[PDB]
Design an enzyme around this catalytic site. Structure first.
Site, PDB file in Angstrom:
ATOM      1  N   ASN A   1       0.784  -1.236   0.000  1.00 22.62           N
ATOM      2  CA  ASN A   1       0.000   0.000   0.000  1.00 22.62           C
ATOM      3  C   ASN A   1       0.816   1.287   0.000  1.00 22.62           C
ATOM      4  OD1 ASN A   1      -2.727   1.464   0.368  1.00 22.62           O
ATOM      5  ND2 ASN A   1      -1.531   2.173   2.137  1.00 22.62           N
TER       6      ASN A   1
ATOM      7  N   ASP B   1       1.002   6.781   0.618  1.00 24.05           N
ATOM      8  CA  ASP B   1       0.361   5.737  -0.186  1.00 24.05           C
ATOM      9  C   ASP B   1       0.802   5.789  -1.653  1.00 24.05           C
ATOM     10  OD1 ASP B   1      -1.392   5.243   2.111  1.00 24.05           O
ATOM     11  OD2 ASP B   1      -2.877   4.484   0.668  1.00 24.05           O
TER      12      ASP B   1
ATOM     13  N   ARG C   1       3.265 -12.715   2.087  1.00 24.65           N
ATOM     14  CA  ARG C   1       2.043 -12.196   2.682  1.00 24.65           C
ATOM     15  C   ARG C   1       1.943 -10.754   2.221  1.00 24.65           C
ATOM     16  NH1 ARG C   1      -0.521 -11.347   8.749  1.00 24.65           N
ATOM     17  NH2 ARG C   1       0.917  -9.582   9.005  1.00 24.65           N
TER      18      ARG C   1
ATOM     19  N   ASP D   1       0.665  -7.183   2.440  1.00 22.62           N
ATOM     20  CA  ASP D   1       0.159  -6.392   3.566  1.00 22.62           C
ATOM     21  C   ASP D   1      -0.535  -5.111   3.125  1.00 22.62           C
ATOM     22  OD1 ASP D   1       1.389  -8.265   5.261  1.00 22.62           O
ATOM     23  OD2 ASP D   1       3.208  -7.062   5.424  1.00 22.62           O
TER      24      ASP D   1
ATOM     25  N   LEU E   1      -5.473  -0.260  -1.160  1.00 16.66           N
ATOM     26  CA  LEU E   1      -4.728   0.130  -2.364  1.00 16.66           C
ATOM     27  C   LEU E   1      -5.366   1.314  -3.089  1.00 16.66           C
ATOM     28  CD1 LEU E   1      -3.410  -3.207  -3.973  1.00 16.66           C
ATOM     29  CD2 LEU E   1      -2.479  -1.791  -2.134  1.00 16.66           C
TER      30      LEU E   1
ATOM     31  N   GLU F   1      -3.315 -10.289   4.054  1.00 21.09           N
ATOM     32  CA  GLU F   1      -3.522  -9.775   5.409  1.00 21.09           C
ATOM     33  C   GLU F   1      -4.686  -8.796   5.354  1.00 21.09           C
ATOM     34  OE1 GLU F   1      -2.068  -6.309   6.018  1.00 21.09           O
ATOM     35  OE2 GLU F   1      -2.981  -6.103   7.999  1.00 21.09           O
TER      36      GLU F   1
ATOM     37  N   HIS G   1      -4.443  -9.709  17.879  1.00 20.86           N
ATOM     38  CA  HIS G   1      -4.243  -8.482  17.116  1.00 20.86           C
ATOM     39  C   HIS G   1      -3.444  -8.702  15.839  1.00 20.86           C
ATOM     40  CE1 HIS G   1      -4.863  -7.169  21.327  1.00 20.86           C
ATOM     41  NE2 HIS G   1      -5.532  -6.170  20.781  1.00 20.86           N
ATOM     42  N   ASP G   2      -3.818  -7.932  14.823  1.00 20.23           N
ATOM     43  CA  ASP G   2      -3.071  -7.799  13.573  1.00 20.23           C
ATOM     44  C   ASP G   2      -1.791  -7.030  13.882  1.00 20.23           C
ATOM     45  OD1 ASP G   2      -2.324  -5.816  11.277  1.00 20.23           O
ATOM     46  OD2 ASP G   2      -3.645  -7.250  10.261  1.00 20.23           O
TER      47      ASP G   2
HETATM   48 CA   LIG Z   1      -3.843   3.298  -1.008  1.00 21.97          CA
HETATM   49 CL   LIG Z   2      -2.028 -10.486  20.445  1.00 24.26          CL
HETATM   50 CL   LIG Z   3      -0.802 -10.322  11.815  1.00 21.72          CL
END
Ligand SMILES: [Ca+2]
Ligand SMILES: [Cl-]
Ligand SMILES: [Cl-]
Ligand SMILES: [Ca+2]
Ligand SMILES: [Cl-]
Ligand SMILES: [Cl-]
Ligand SMILES: [Cl-]
Ligand SMILES: [Cl-]
Ligand SMILES: [Cl-]
Ligand SMILES: [Mg+2]
Ligand SMILES: [Mg+2]
Lengths: 571, 549
Positions: free
Chosen positions: A116, A184, A212, A214, A219, A256, A325-326
């Protein structure tokens, strides 16, 4: 940009378009695993030397968080050069050496790739702001005002005053969904799309097994929308998958997308072609629901998210992990309308205390060994491909004061020696310190101390991984929840459809039973469809009484679980 | 306390963070009641005035230097009533209290700023510095150049730019608005009415901005400081104002005000280059970096006093003072790998000196015998370490280590609830470094430090005496006399790691008997021949020069 030609490439493993469905992933940070050159920082050569341990543990694929050149203002998710590894970690050649050595042991490697945005220190951005009518002028999203895209939330609302930032050099505002130092990229510029596809190809040519991807939901932006999950975003993801499958068969793309499961299904792509976007995506609500199921001593929060998860393409697989959490945004996924547990998390004081902070497994469970085993058993037997986080296999702790992400990024604890055996450098030069308290400190918790006893958490985890690897139903089996008399116990069977030239333990059905209560519990199961089969417990191989027409009674200690192979009877 | 307009010249200050000292309520965070309960320790140590860093209500995004309400104690510390309790308990023991007050800016969470941005035509509309452009004041440097793209930030609610010398969440107050000047004077009076003994005024060089200038040290800035001093002089005699100006000493003298009045701005200001010069003097085994910085420091008003401390960085900006043109050591700091490693990070005394007890004593002796009023930092008296990974400032803000018990005896809370963790390593960890363990032996660093404070307190020469550098045969040794007129003291300091002899011309005091101040042993009387003193590596001696019968 460097060309892949001037570097070596790794020898490719034999093509296996299903490998990621059978894989157990191991998320390991290069900076944290092993410092081979005494500078206090983990490095690629160090990771290479520790492949013997990784092979012994029995995981199938390494997942490396970003290791690209970066000023590290946001953990390395702020990338300064996609074609260069951070110098303290080594060089591209060191990465090729790591890939080759991993491939020799049958181990694959994927890495995080932020699609991104870049760091504002990236040369594209410096050229974009200094030379507006040059070839990088439209590489980012520029405006004379800060009024566009008003319906998009500010992700980091307590830190960023706006998604637009005024640049002192170009004298216009630029867009950023993340921090102001992470502008961005403009995906409406076809040169940006080609530049990013070229990034993927660079690492794929080197021999990486996948990525992965992210921050992909963010986008493209469009007026009238909240600027997430747009059609053009999915369109670009189809380009990535097409490039991947046409030029590099047998590699993988993981998405993700920190969203409710019904919403992430779109990231697998068109069901009709068998899936034409990402091969994998993460099922984020699983751990919060398991966590709450235990707190509540009830199977339903787990039963429910699984039942409500929509089917995905045949080609595709969910990724699962024991975190709330992410790691990019430090947000826990939820949904006001579709999550029946929405308001319940705030009522749990353990949940509440850790909002926005990554914690390791043992600390999340207050170091209760029985619970660590239960959560690990679930991770290894529920549908999806599991990701273990480095150090959870020995029960490492965390250090919350280091930061919301860095809490879980302290050095791997190899021995009870100086710096936990991670480095020969002086302690003051470590990138982060090891745990030093009486519970989680390296004098008590380390790999060496756990290698001896068959009863250590490390040896238990390694054996569970070995058992899983010998039973296909865990990786690609169906999922049949069995219900049962007792709401405190979650029971399910997983089955292989079975085609041509198989028949053996590897393809036999499996029965898993999990006690969410802290007290001993009985459960009576209706297994009449399996009448005559012999449940064989997987760790000790003891034959249990054959299944009859009557309900089958199993008894479990608090937080206990059993795994059984269902063996077909003798004629 | 009875008014005593010179108390600050005789004081030893003790910088102690409320959050770090003692948690009396088991929430994991130090508090005012806890600090009150530890006053017997502070009295026993022998310090004269506490210096508390900001304890006001704040979102704590910049260590509490981002203030949300000047009139309110941060709730986790207690309330204004707990502060008065602390004040009264300290005064009862003869201890005074000063605090940091940030004058230049508030947090963006301050109600003044939220009114300024939401209601521009209202009474707070001009409380901050607003502009349609980011072009004004282009000659002002960006202090936090690695973090802030500009000194102007565009506000999405008001849709104009506002000025900030510090972080973007710290908007500058508009001192050209007379209502801002009155509001800030009122903040001073509020705390003075409660009974506080003074303030360190922070970020004051940045108050006013003017086109064509670098927006520091402007005459209107000094004019406002004169208003502060006048308010003190007229309404609260016997209180003190300290300036935090991280500038070369020659430039700082302006902050004491007009010499013709005996000083009409701050009573005190800090001498920032002292520690970097002492540090380099020891690294080079030469007295010159110290001799030169003292000799080149201009005279200040007679009712004024320098503050001195053993730190290489200002706590607000994390910058070390220097001067390309007037500092001969300018290029030398970068050649020292110890200085280089710690650039921009606060470190405690023991870690700065690699835990070398001889050097800790040497640096402390210099702090307590050089001209000025010294500030001790909490924990340095037991040799506490730091934890650099916690942050450039939080490095030195870990809990006070009282005992080898759980949480170093700082709190009864669970360890995971502490605001910051104690040191846990083999050298500085609380299992080995703590007050309790050092209370017993007369040879601990704590008891040594306490004794040095007791000795200093018995000689007015250290506080207000003249300073005469004696030179001498050996450039590795720094020798000087402090004198007030009846009380004369001789201090000799070995900057070399090896034993050193020094021959001193003490003819002016011929006949006098040097009495060493720790053991009271009488040394040979001074004659007309040069007086030989011999010191071990990094050693020092303090002598009282006693008149003959
Ligand atoms: Ca973007
Ligand atoms: Cl966590
Ligand atoms: Cl994650
Ligand atoms: Ca100002
Ligand atoms: Cl890393
Ligand atoms: Cl504090
Ligand atoms: Cl209050
Ligand atoms: Cl300071
Ligand atoms: Cl410092
Ligand atoms: Mg290294
Ligand atoms: Mg407290």
């Amino acid at each position: 940009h460097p060309n892949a030609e001037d570097f070596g490439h790794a020898r490719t493993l034999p093509t296996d378009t299903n490998w990621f469905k059978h894989a157990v992933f191991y998320e390991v940070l290069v900076r944290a695993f092993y410092d081979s050159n005494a500078d206090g920082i983990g490095d690629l050569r160090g990771l290479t030397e520790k492949l013997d341990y990784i092979k012994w543990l029995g995981v199938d694929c390494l997942w490396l968080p970003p290791f690209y050149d970066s000023p590290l203002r946001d953990g390395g998710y702020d990338i300064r050069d996609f074609y260069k590894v951070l110098p303290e970690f080594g060089t591209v050649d060191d990465f090729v050496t790591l890939l080759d050595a991993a491939h020799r042991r049958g181990i694959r490697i994927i890495t995080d790739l932020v699609m991104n945005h870049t760091s504002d220190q990236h040369e594209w951005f410096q050229e974009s702001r200094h030379n507006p009518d040059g070839p990088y002028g439209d590489f980012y999203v520029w405006s004379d005002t800060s009024d566009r895209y008003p319906d998009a939330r500010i992700i980091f609302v307590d830190t960023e005053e706006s998604n637009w930032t005024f640049d002192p050099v170009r004298r216009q505002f630029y867009w950023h969904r993340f921090f102001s130092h992470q502008p961005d990229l403009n995906y409406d510029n076809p040169a940006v799309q080609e530049a990013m596809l070229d990034v993927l190809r660079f690492w794929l040519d080197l021999g990486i097994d996948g990525f992965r991807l992210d921050a992909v939901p963010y986008l493209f932006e469009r007026e009238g929308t909240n600027c997430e999950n747009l059609p053009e975003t999915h369109a670009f993801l189809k380009r990535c998958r097409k490039a991947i499958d046409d030029e590099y068969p047998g590699r993988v793309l993981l998405a993700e997308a920190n969203q409710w499961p019904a919403d992430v299904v779109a990231y697998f792509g068109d069901p009709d072609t068998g899936g034409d976007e990402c091969h994998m995506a993460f099922h984020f609500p699983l751990m919060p629901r398991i966590f709450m199921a235990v707190r509540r001593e009830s199977r339903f929060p787990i039963s429910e998210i699984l039942a409500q998860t929509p089917p995905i393409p045949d080609t595709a697989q969910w990724g699962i992990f024991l975190r709330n959490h992410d790691e990019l945004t430090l947000e826990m996924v939820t949904d006001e309308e579709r999550d029946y547990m929405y308001a319940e998390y705030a009522k749990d004081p353990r949940m509440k205390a850790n909002v926005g902070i990554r914690r390791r497994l043992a600390p999340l469970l207050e170091n209760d060994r029985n619970q660590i085993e239960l959560f690990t058993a679930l991770l290894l037997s529920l549908p999806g491909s599991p990701v273990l986080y480095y150090g959870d296999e020995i029960g490492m702790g965390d250090i919350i004061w280091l930061g919301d992400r860095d809490s879980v990024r302290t050095p791997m604890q190899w021995t009870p020696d100086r710096n936990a055996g991670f480095s020969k450098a002086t302690p003051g030069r470590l990138y982060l310190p090891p745990n030093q308290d009486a519970v989680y400190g390296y004098h008590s918790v380390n790999v060496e101390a756990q290698l001896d006893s068959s009863s250590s958490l490390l040896n238990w985890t390694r054996n569970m991984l070995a058992v899983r690897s010998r039973h296909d139903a865990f990786a690609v089996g169906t999922f049949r929840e069995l219900g049962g008399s007792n709401p405190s116990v979650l029971a399910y069977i997983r089955e292989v459809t079975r085609q041509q030239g198989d028949g053996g333990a590897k393809t036999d059905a499996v029965l898993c039973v999990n006690n969410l209560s802290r007290f001993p519990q009985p459960i009576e199961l209706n297994l009449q469809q399996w009448a005559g089969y012999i449940p064989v417990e997987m760790t000790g191989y003891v034959e249990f009484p054959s299944i009859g027409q009557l309900p089958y009674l199993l008894t479990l200690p608090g937080h206990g679980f059993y795994w059984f192979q269902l063996r077909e009877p003798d004629p």
